[PDB]
Design a protein around this ligand. Structure first.
Ligand SMILES: Nc1ncnc2c1ncn2[C@@H]1O[C@H](COP(=O)(O)OP(=O)(O)OP(=O)(O)O)[C@@H](O)[C@H]1O
Ligand SMILES: Nc1ncnc2c1ncn2[C@@H]1O[C@H](COP(=O)(O)OP(=O)(O)O)[C@@H](O)[C@H]1O
Ligand SMILES: Nc1ncnc2c1ncn2[C@@H]1O[C@H](COP(=O)(O)OP(=O)(O)O)[C@@H](O)[C@H]1O
Ligand SMILES: Nc1ncnc2c1ncn2[C@@H]1O[C@H](COP(=O)(O)OP(=O)(O)O)[C@@H](O)[C@H]1O
Lengths: 443, 439, 36, 146, 434, 434
């Protein structure tokens, strides 16, 4: 089965149809004004109207702003791109900071483009170059078509084909009893290998025998393929079509990120608009989420000014746990949430608050029952009291080691005496900092 | 219903500077409102850009945050139209790892000069009625062949050449394909099959939507206009088969011996009448990010006859020029600030602030009561304009969640309590001051 | 084709170089080397 | 007009430095031991791969059962330089079209007992919608990768 | 007699993490001494690691210099054993010149998750005795030998081409994966080490193989999740496993591998063995890299982290800001701190006895007494170094068991910090700078 | 002849058989306490058991730290790897700082590999290839000492064919390496044409067949590098190798795991033996805090060499900490991991002996009336300045037609070349003109 993460219980925002927040739903509790705000932001994103609008979830460590930003990803579901980042991802050694931001902006916009796949495939039981009754004037013989006798586990059927196919079957090495395929949209024939039917006819032969296909000789489906506009940036910036000397040299050299031009963005936009107008491609504008936004350089913040105002951009969710810090990449300039005031003016700020003791207890219960743990109510009351003296994170983190200790002591549920052992084995930031201050000259 | 790649951004309502033909700013026109002095001045530089007679011109748009500096610049980018190059660069973007700062400015400059080439060639455009390809049994091995082409009016037979033959078979053209051949170059291009061959065919060798047979005369001319900028002329010339670097961004620090040769050969293409060099605009948005190294390049790059016009924006007081301890106006060194014209924007009145919110609701397809506009105008004067602009969307979304047809004042009072102004978040950060990090 | 040890249901994998019989495992090689 | 065609005197290396001064030559008997002690020797690949002692046991070259690569293909690719790299690339371009039409249609049942990873199961870069085999297989996307 | 490539390092003696079944620590066992609370905490996280049930858990082992923090992490790495990854780094190893601080941490995480896979195989493995081919299409016959059997293969057309392109001859040793037909020479048989008397630079001589000739078996493989990412970064990406020549692997590759490896555990094809990442000296991490660990500790395929640190309330690297351990508070509450304690004389004896037991040294009990004072007064890691020098002084003197006089001799030769700084402060104006 | 160098006179620690220092021996003088400490370190390195154990030579500029570290190299001789590096070598631009430490730690562990070097050379009398293609190639070789025939493998014959060899060429074959060199046509065929574009060498005046038991030295870093990137693979004789220039690269810790597991597989066979060596990280105070903190892993690891540091800095700032002062310029956390050896300023008589040892090494005859003056000028200045005057003073004596130093030569040189402290007085006086 899956292994539980720090956010595996977050299943959504748990809002009413009226957009109000329930006390405890979808694995969240509390934060109601910030959950309601995220309710408006889910509508902002699902509307597909807006570009480059941005929100800043601002609040102390452990108050839930990464949980809310991930709850939005659950309210949206997998149909639309949600692109997680930290501010620290911008410090690449291969490409400038501002282009890492531009690539992450272009990841948060998805095409959803759909097409027919059609292929003819099977074990080739014959290749009959089929002649006309007489040649044309001055000729010895004429082939009007090849007949290829493809077979699969559903049946055999002959395909009539253009005579030029033989001048590709002999560029391959196709022989009777191979399994082969033909791309119905392109007429290219490709050989997979001798069919598994022949795997016994030598003690050794130098090919991987291929299992016989199932379903008809002619296969069709429509398929929906979802690509970010950043996949289109990369596939145009570094082509994979192998048979050019520069394609091979570019594929033998080390791969690299490269500073993609505004012109490639322009040309891609000019072609996806062709396919959106022709109804061939849906669009799903989505979310860029940056956590730890206070790690961006002032050049990165001053690039977000252009990027957020741009009519292409995704909805952006910022998150920050900082007070009045210095803006990174300036020496002395203190600014609220570690963000320049002229970026902080461009974003809808959402205040995320400290939990009350009862909300911490309710979260610890929801962690325990999704972490797979049974806890006694007197142990939970004690663990909520530990949380109130420390942090939500430390009091949640005591659950799995208390379950290991209970299990080692032969019991199926956390008792009072288990939590106070783990609380003595493992310190928190508040209690550890006191030890460092008392032992100041020894570290 | 359907949604295109460009959507409702921060400036999408702006469609030009809203000047009349005597160059006076109207109070509200082409989406711009108020701001008379800076819009009038931008009209003069826009006319100077479009006149194109003089190189090495710089304009700095200055004033408080949220007062239309970027609105004017992203506004004249629309009034100048798409046919003339306008390059928007944030001052952060020149800080490359593929190239130096002075290279990234030399590219941003030269990417803002167009070389408009009109290309015309004879094309043959028809349904392929047949192809004959003849191949010798071995011999010297030269192929020879014929092609027959049809329109709804016309037909002919071409005895093909050798290079045409390898292109037609490379591109796997077949009878019933509709094609468009560049007669000057031997490049094929394919439109699709004609409908007529649903009757006789093989098991499918190709599949597409069908296309109608081409009309009229079999031979027709085509005209293309290419706005190839000088930077992309330098990249094409920097190495043989360099064309992918136009997209890939791969070429760092192109040789001066290439640029000084392109500056000669583009002048010859102007004097030959072969190409129209069109000066454009470089808009260095947030230019207070440039290092003093970059500003000193702008002192002297800005004096070639191949320099574009440039426009800058800044929202900075007396501040230290980035990369130094020296304080100066706009954070720009006086070496450059002496070399340019400064267009100064103004804070908004109530009348203008309300009128911006009124054109904004008209772009966003929002209805609000006059009571709601009144409260939102007060909010956009007590707080900044950008906050009030943003509450329009949130208030329309809250209104839609309660199934309302028009935003009321209590939807805005709701949203104002829901999403904070900076000035209110920075106040609540005082009562939880010990809980936030690194105060 | 099948192993030539008479009790053996396995496919032929290889043949004995001494006696030429088809074989499938070391156990069938040892048995074939006994019964010749 | 045509460029100025300068040519310099060739760089003169003495018979002495050519005979005795090339480290590739005078250390060739020592360079052999850098190759005999190489973990890329097909003997040590086989012994590291199939003759492990533990019921579970970590070893390198475990990925060679899930890339297509043979132990001697990996040795030749490591010990025979950029020519062997290039030939092994050209054949991997060919093999990707064979892998893609398997990977995109062989969906039902399973590869064996609905368990065991098959050879090539780590070659995942074909599954991207924009991968060259899929981009060649589906005619629409080929126009977005222009 | 023979000296192995791995030999007596500073933690070599701690062959485990001494615990009873109830996780009660023994006062001295598996080489570890004392530190009872920190060894219970280490045991509880060791069972949390062995479970693998929950992700991105992190433990910071913190305490004064010499107080066993790397010892607990190395004793724990030995007690966890092989067959579950344990990536150890110093925190300063992430500062690469060819990839970001994000990347070197992301690789260090991904290299600690083990995808464990079953694979089904048959390989031929033997000395080729001879090859027969006719001259018509060809149908050759080829003999394989192993110490247990001599056998012949009827072989197909493509095989004859492959054997003659790979130039096999009698007395070569070969393998062939039958499922794929790929030949692989291993060498020439030792029984054949004379049919030439000058031989090519990449010939190798090997034993003739043994057991069954066409072994049919399943084999398990463990692949660290990083290798699956590297192999997919570029076409011949596996060469960059060994070369280190890869960096900045695309996020769209890593999130594809997550979805695929999740699909394999859902199909039951492979299971994810979550290992440990140990960052010794984690206080060297930059603020831009601690802020990455914050979101790294939240993937369902993050490792368990362990960190060691040795810092008071101290300036976080890349900032003006003081904090506990030199680590940001926004990471320190995701962490779960384990505190190590200074040693008593009682414990400092037993650890010096265990180091002498590891180093193959006998000492007089008076010599352990005087050395225990030296280790208690100066530093434990100085007394742990005197015992080797005292053995060498004693051997040079033709003794056998180190005497108190041999300890005092070494202590007169090799200074600690405190005596060396005193002599530096006496001669001071001769040294450069302060 | 050889060139005299700043240390070419030190030939060992000069200790007696008890391990105590002689007053003056093996080119060293004085320094007895540090020389006796280095005696224990030479016994430690000769004992092979230890890994990562490290030593700091601490003390003022010009007090013998590098002379004693090279004395340790001379006590061990060429038979054990001694790898010198400056701490300043760590700042590479192709790889990270904490890789250059690991490369140099891997240069200081050696393998010793015996093989019987087996050379054949002579005029090729015939080449005759013999399977139906080539089973083996018979070659005949002749010299003015006799004739032999060899049974070459087909890969050696491919090498003869790449060297464009024909009957009558003079060839060098090496039977271990499979190396082949054409040396020229045998000059008995020098009349075959009157001009041909070939060089004709006389038939060798030596044996057709020569043997040595050679004893090869190689290091784990030679293995790491030659196995990490794909080899150049061809003897030039290629042009793919024109495209990709080499670079130094961050060799992964997972490759080094396999190199260790392979070298264990060979030293168990007795095919190689290990020689744990010394890394001499000279001027360690020039390492950065990230490099220093990586040593807190590298000195613990069970594989590592012995490490000798040297430093002459006072209570100065630790490089890369922007603030933190620490003794010898080294973090206290590392200074608690090393056995410190003190180094002392000499008395004038001990300098005067060094001046004579320098003179009688450097090739100078010196009269006592001048040697007393260099002894005095050493006390007025520093030891290295006095020593530096010897060649200049002898070179004026040689120009003045004299066989020896006398007072007037050293006295003239003193008034002609300034020392570091008399020149500093000139710069302090003329402060406004520099
Ligand atoms: N027996 C000796 N005792 C001490 N020093 C000696 C002795 N023999 C040689 N030296 C002197 O060592 C000097 C140069 O190396 P030395 O170790 O003194 O450099 P250092 O300044 O102390 O250290 P570093 O190499 O870090 O600069 C030379 O003048 C040399 O003559
Ligand atoms: N409102 C909530 N309801 C339920 N669980 C929550 C909530 N907020 C936080 N959590 C839990 O507490 C943890 C701490 O919140 P998180 O978002 O990671 O902190 P931070 O705001 O500093 O980024 C979450 O990972 C989750 O386990
Ligand atoms: N004169 C204007 N006419 C229309 N919209 C304006 C005007 N001035 C400002 N705005 C709007 O106010 C917002 C912020 O103004 P902007 O020019 O982008 O800020 P800044 O002055 O700091 O660069 C934008 O949405 C912009 O369209
Ligand atoms: N509890 C212990 N049991 C065994 N060895 C220990 C113990 N504590 C310290 N040591 C030994 O002391 C030396 C230094 O301990 P270490 O953990 O490396 O110090 P630190 O925590 O400061 O980095 C090592 O040789 C180590 O094995």
């Amino acid at each position: 089965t899956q292994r539980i993460a720090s956010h595996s219980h977050v299943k959504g925002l748990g809002l009413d149809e009226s957009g109000l927040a329930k006390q405890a739903a979808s694995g969240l509790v509390g934060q109601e004004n910030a959950r309601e705000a995220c309710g408006v932001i889910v509508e902002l994103i699902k509307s597909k109207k807006m570009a480059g609008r941005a929100v800043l979830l601002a609040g102390p460590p452990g108050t839930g702003k990464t949980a809310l930003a991930l709850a939005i990803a659950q309210e949206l579901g997998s149909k639309v791109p949600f692109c997680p980042m930290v501010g620290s991802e911008v410090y690449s050694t291969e490409i400038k900071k501002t282009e890492v931001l531009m690539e992450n902006f272009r990841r948060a916009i998805g095409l959803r483009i759909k097409e027919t796949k059609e292929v003819y495939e099977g074990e080739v039981t014959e290749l009959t170059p089929c002649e006309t009754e007489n040649p044309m004037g001055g000729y010895g013989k004429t082939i009007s078509h090849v007949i290829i006798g493809l077979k699969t586990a559903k049946g055999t059927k002959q395909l009539k084909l253009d005579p030029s196919i033989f001048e590709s079957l002999q560029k391959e090495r196709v022989e009777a009893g191979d399994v082969i395929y033909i791309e119905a949209n392109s007429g290219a024939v490709k050989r997979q290998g001798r069919c598994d039917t022949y795997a016994t006819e030598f003690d050794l032969e130098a090919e991987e025998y291929v299992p016989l296909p199932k379903g008809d000789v002619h296969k069709k489906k429509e398929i929906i393929q979802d690509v970010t506009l950043h996949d289109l940036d990369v596939a145009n910036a570094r082509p994979q079509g192998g048979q050019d000397i520069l394609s091979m040299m570019g594929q033998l050299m080390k791969p690299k990120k490269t500073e993609i031009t505004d012109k490639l963005r322009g040309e891609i936009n000019k072609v996806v608009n062709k396919y959106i107008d022709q109804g061939i491609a849906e669009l799903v504008p989505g979310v860029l989420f940056v956590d730890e936004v206070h790690m961006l350089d002032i050049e990165c913040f001053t690039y977000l000014h252009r990027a957020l105002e741009s009519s292409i951009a995704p909805i952006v969710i910022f998150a920050s746990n900082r007070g009045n810090c210095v803006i990174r990449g300036t020496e002395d300039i203190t600014s609220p949430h570690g963000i320049p005031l002229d970026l902080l003016d461009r974003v809808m700020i959402i205040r995320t608050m400290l939990y009350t003791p009862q909300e911490m207890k309710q979260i610890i219960k929801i962690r325990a029952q999704t972490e797979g743990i049974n806890i006694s109510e007197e142990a939970l009351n004690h663990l909520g009291e530990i949380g109130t003296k420390t942090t939500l994170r430390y009091s949640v983190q005591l659950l799995t080691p208390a379950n290991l200790l209970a299990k080692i002591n032969g019991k199926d549920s956390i008792e009072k005496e288990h939590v106070e052992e783990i609380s003595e084995l493992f310190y928190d930031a508040k209690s550890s900092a006191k030890i460092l201050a008392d032992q100041q000259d020894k570290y | 219903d359907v949604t295109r790649i460009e959507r409702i951004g921060a400036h999408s309502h702006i469609r030009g500077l809203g000047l009349d033909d005597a160059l006076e700013p109207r109070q509200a026109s082409q989406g711009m409102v108020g701001q008379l002095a800076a819009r009038r001045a931008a009209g003069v530089v826009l006319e100077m850009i479009r006149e194109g007679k003089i190189a090495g011109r710089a304009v700095l748009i200055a004033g408080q945050p949220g007062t239309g500096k970027t609105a004017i610049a992203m506004g004249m980018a629309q009034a100048l139209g798409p046919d003339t190059p306008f390059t928007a660069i944030a001052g952060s973007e020149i800080f490359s790892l593929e190239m130096s700062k002075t290279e990234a400015l030399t590219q941003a400059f030269r990417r803002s000069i167009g070389v408009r080439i009109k290309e015309e060639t004879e094309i043959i455009e028809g349904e392929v009625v047949e192809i004959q390809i003849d191949r010798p049994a071995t011999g010297t091995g030269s192929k020879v062949g014929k092609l027959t082409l049809k329109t709804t009016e016309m037909e002919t037979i071409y005895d093909l050449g050798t290079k045409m033959i390898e292109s037609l078979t490379k591109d796997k053209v077949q009878a019933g394909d509709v094609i468009t051949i560049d007669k000057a170059t031997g490049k094929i291009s394919k439109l699709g099959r004609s409908f007529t061959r649903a009757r006789d065919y093989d098991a499918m060798g190709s599949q597409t939507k069908f296309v109608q047979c081409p009309d009229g005369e079999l031979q027709k001319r085509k005209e293309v206009v290419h706005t190839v900028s000088l930077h992309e002329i330098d990249v094409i010339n920097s190495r043989t088969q360099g064309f992918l670097a136009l997209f890939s961004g791969d070429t760092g620090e192109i040789k001066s011996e290439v640029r000084e040769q392109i500056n000669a050969k583009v002048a010859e293409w102007r004097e030959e009448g072969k190409a129209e060099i069109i000066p454009g605009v470089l808009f260095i948005d947030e230019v207070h990010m440039l290092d003093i190294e970059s500003f000193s390049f702008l002192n002297r790059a800005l004096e070639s006859d191949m320099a574009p016009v440039l426009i800058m924006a800044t929202n900075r007081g007396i501040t230290r020029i980035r990369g130094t301890s020296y304080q100066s106006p706009h954070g720009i060194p006086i070496d450059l600030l002496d070399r340019l014209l400064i267009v100064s924007t103004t804070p908004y009145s109530e009348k203008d602030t309300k009128q911006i919110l009124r054109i904004r609701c008209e772009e966003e397809d929002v209805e609000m009561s006059e009571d709601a506009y009144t409260v939102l105008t007060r909010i956009g004067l007590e707080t900044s304009l950008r906050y009030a602009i943003q509450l329009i969307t949130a208030a329309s979304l809250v209104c839609r969640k309660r199934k309302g047809t028009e935003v009321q004042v209590d939807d805005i009072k709701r949203v104002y309590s829901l999403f904070l102004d900076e000035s209110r978040s920075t106040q609540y950060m005082k009562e939880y001051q010990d809980a936030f990090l690194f105060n | 084709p099948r192993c030539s040890v008479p009790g053996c249901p396995h496919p032929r994998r290889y043949a004995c170089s001494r006696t030429g019989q088809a074989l499938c495992s070391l156990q069938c090689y040892r048995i074939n080397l006994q019964m010749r | 007009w045509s460029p100025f065609h300068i040519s310099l005197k060739p760089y003169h290396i003495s018979k002495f430095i050519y005979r005795h001064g090339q480290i590739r030559v005078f250390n060739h008997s020592r360079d052999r031991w850098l190759r005999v002690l190489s973990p890329f020797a097909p003997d040590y690949i086989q012994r590291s791969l199939f003759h492990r002692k533990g019921i579970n046991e970590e070893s390198c070259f475990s990925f060679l059962r899930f890339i297509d690569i043979s132990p001697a293909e990996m040795a030749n690719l490591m010990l025979q330089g950029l020519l062997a790299r290039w030939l092994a690339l050209f054949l991997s371009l060919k093999a990707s079209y064979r892998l893609h039409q398997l990977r995109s249609w062989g969906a039902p049942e399973g590869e064996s007992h609905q368990r065991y990873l098959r050879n090539k199961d780590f070659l995942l870069g074909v599954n991207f919608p924009l991968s060259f085999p899929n981009l060649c297989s589906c005619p629409l996307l080929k126009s977005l990768v222009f």
